[PDB]
């Protein structure tokens, strides 16, 4: 769920999910249109695609468990939906950590009309 996902992101990057990653570029958040603006936005795009691979799961509400093994994220064993949701989130959190260097505030609250072009998962 968004509860577990927010806490991972905070742990990983030290930024709060809302407002740092809830309205960033074209894909972090609500969004789903156009060309991702930068590496961080790409993390969100791949994360959206990841959720897209799960039809009959509910990523926003479905709760999974995970533990830290010296920093490493380890998804604990639940339903198959919970397992796969946790892996999508884990990949996003790390992707975020990897790209922190190029995170730009210029992309926060990015306007919809500038979210142009197309990209297939």
């Amino acid at each position: 769920s968004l509860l577990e996902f927010g806490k991972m992101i905070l742990e990983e990057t030290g930024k709060l999910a809302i407002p740092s990653y809830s309205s960033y570029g074209c894909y972090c958040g609500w969004g789903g249109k156009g060309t991702p603006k930068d590496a961080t936005d790409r993390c969100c795009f791949v994360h959206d695609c990841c959720y897209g691979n799960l039809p009959d799961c509910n990523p926003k509400s479905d709760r999974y468990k995970y533990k830290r093994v010296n920093g490493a994220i380890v998804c604990e064993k639940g339903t198959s939906c919970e397992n796969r949701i946790c892996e999508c989130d884990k990949a996003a959190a790390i992707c975020f950590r990897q790209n922190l260097n190029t995170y730009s505030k210029k992309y926060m609250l990015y306007p919809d009309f500038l979210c142009k072009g197309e990209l297939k998962c």
């Binding site: 968004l2 999910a17 958040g29 609500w30």
Partner: peptide
């Protein structure tokens, strides 16, 4: 909480 909700990154959507």
């Amino acid at each position: 909480a909700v990154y959507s």
